[PDB]
Amino acid sequence: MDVMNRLILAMDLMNRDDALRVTGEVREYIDTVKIGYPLVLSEGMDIIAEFRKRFGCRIIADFKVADIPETNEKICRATFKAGADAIIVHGFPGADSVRACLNVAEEMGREVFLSTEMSHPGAEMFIQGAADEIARMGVDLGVKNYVGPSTRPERLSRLREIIGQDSFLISPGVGAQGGDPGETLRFADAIIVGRSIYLADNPAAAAAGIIESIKDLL
Amino acid sequence: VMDVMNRLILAMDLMNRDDALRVTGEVREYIDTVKIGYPLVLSEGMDIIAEFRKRFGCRIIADFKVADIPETNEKICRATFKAGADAIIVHGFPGADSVRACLNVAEEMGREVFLSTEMSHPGAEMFIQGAADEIARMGVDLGVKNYVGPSTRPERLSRLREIIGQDSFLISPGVGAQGGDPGETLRFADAIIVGRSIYLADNPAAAAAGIIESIKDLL
Numbered sequence: 230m231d232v233m234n235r236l237i238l239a240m241d242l243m244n245r246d247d248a249l250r251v252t253g254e255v256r257e258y259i260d261t262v263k264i265g266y267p268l269v270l271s272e273g274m275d276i277i278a279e280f281r282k283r284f285g286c287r288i289i290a291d292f293k294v295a296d297i298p299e300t301n302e303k304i305c306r307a308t309f310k311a312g313a314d315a316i317i318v319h320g321f322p323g324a325d326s327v328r329a330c331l332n333v334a335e336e337m338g339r340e341v342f343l344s345t346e347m348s349h350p351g352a353e354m355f356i357q358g359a360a361d362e363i364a365r366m367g368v369d370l371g372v373k374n375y376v377g378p379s380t381r382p383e384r385l386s387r388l389r390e391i392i393g394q395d396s397f398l399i400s401p402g403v404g405a406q407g408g409d410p411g412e413t414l415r416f417a418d419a420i421i422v423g424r425s426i427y428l429a430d431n432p433a434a435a436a437a438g439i440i441e442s443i444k445d446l447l
Numbered sequence: 448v449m450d451v452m453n454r455l456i457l458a459m460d461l462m463n464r465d466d467a468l469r470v471t472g473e474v475r476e477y478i479d480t481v482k483i484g485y486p487l488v489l490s491e492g493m494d495i496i497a498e499f500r501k502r503f504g505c506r507i508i509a510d511f512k513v514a515d516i517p518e519t520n521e522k523i524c525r526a527t528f529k530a531g532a533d534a535i536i537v538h539g540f541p542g543a544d545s546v547r548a549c550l551n552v553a554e555e556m557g558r559e560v561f562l563s564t565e566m567s568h569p570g571a572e573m574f575i576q577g578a579a580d581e582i583a584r585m586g587v588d589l590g591v592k593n594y595v596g597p598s599t600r601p602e603r604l605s606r607l608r609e610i611i612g613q614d615s616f617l618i619s620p621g622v623g624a625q626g627g628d629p630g631e632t633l634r635f636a637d638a639i640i641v642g643r644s645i646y647l648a649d650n651p652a653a654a655a656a657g658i659i660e661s662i663k664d665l666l
């Protein structure tokens with residue numbers, strides 16, 4: 230997956246007008262948008278097609294899929310029907326649940342991203358201790374796309390070691406949560422950035438600033 | 448605690464509005480509590496909650512397995528309660544801050560959180576099972592009152608009931624299609640969740656009635 234400027238916008242505004250306007254403002258800097266439940270549950274699944282119509286961007290549906298296999302399959306089908314290019318899936322519920330998502334993604338020509346370790350403090354309680362094993366499970370299952378934490382570059386580095394250089398790794402927690410763009414890109418192929426861009430006084434200048442700071446890495 | 452008619456919650460995971468409405472209407476005399484998840488919501492919109500409220504006298508539990516960072520969890524809970532859900536189901540494995548974010552919104556908005564403890568499917572044995580007792584204890588520490596645990600592992604459901612105490616509310620999926628027994632599950636759970644055994648039946652009303660007949664002495 231070829232992400233422009235190694236920068237994925239996390240579009241978590243919850244109003245259609247603002248989400249479309251802000252995405253429009255930074256469109257020259259990105260070609261990949263992560264859309265999650267804050268926007269989808271506020272404005273409907275039709276928002277995905279709208280983004281494709283307006284921007285042509287790729288859409289990663291960050292739905293943290295985390296149910297039993299049968300339900301996971303349904304969630305993935307509905308999500309890809311809406312035009313998402315990829316979906317993010319939790320590993321903590323185990324291999325059968327991940328495989329259910331992989332099957333639908335294969336059927337519809339899409340990609341699954343596996344959540345390994347999350348970026349927030351609570352991730353230390355249960356997720357962190359399972360994360361290396363989740364990553365190895367991904368490798369065993371043939372998962373090629375992974376998500377890991379900007380806020381813990383030592384953990385992000387370990388996760389990169391496990392999955393290898395051929396796998397694709399994206400990383401949230403940059404900016405608002407304290408992660409550094411350049412340091413994160415030592416290990417991740419692309420950074421995910423939400424609030425530092427979409428809550429900025431000038432989102433275009435914020436995006437430009439981030440890109441300037443990583444210019445040598447592009 | 449919510450007063451669940453016949454101790455039976457319908458898991459309405461049909462993805463077509465017409466079928467979902469038809470089946471729910473057919474079983475309405477037996478069930479006043481419906482669990483609506485992402486299969487239906489992502490197919491038909493959050494307005495499906497509004498439509499169920501309009502058509503049926505049913506409480507709505509939004510089974511959204513909320514499993515993000517605290518900031519995103521808050522946004523998901525707010526959107527879900529705004530749409531009219533009485534309660535939302537949240538994962539515990541992302542940790543206490545993520546659960547607390549949901550509890551805070553629920554408190555502010557006058558609604559309820561249900562905490563997933565151990566899940567019912569085989570994959571739950573890999574990571575969730577080993578964390579589940581601690582997830583339940585965490586819920587107790589955080590003041591969580593409502594919990595979800597697995598019909599498919601009676602011994603685990605029993606232990607989770609002990610952890611949360613008799614005063615907590617416990618609902619349990621995995622009955623029917625996944626192999627769990629209604630009566631055995633109700634030894635520990637306040638209510639059972641049933642999906643496919645009802646909604647894929649030739650006569651969903653007869654299927655619901657049959658389940659209820661089998662647990663009649665437990666009502």
Ligand SMILES: O=c1cc(O)n([C@@H]2O[C@H](COP(=O)(O)O)[C@@H](O)[C@H]2O)c(=O)[nH]1
Pocket residue numbers: 239241265291346347348349376377378401402403404405406421422423424425515516519
């Ligand atoms: O470990 C993770 C996984 C995520 O998907 N995310 C998501 O990435 C985005 C981070 O946005 P922000 O840059 O505003 O912190 C949010 O949409 C969040 O749900 C995260 O923050 N940490």
Ligand SMILES: O=c1cc(O)n([C@@H]2O[C@H](COP(=O)(O)O)[C@@H](O)[C@H]2O)c(=O)[nH]1
Pocket residue numbers: 296297300458460484510565566567568595596597620621622623624625640641642643644
């Ligand atoms: O551990 C769990 C937790 C659940 O919410 N569920 C949910 O409960 C329902 C079970 O439906 P069914 O009776 O068709 O197996 C589904 O909506 C599933 O997503 C589950 O099966 N196991």
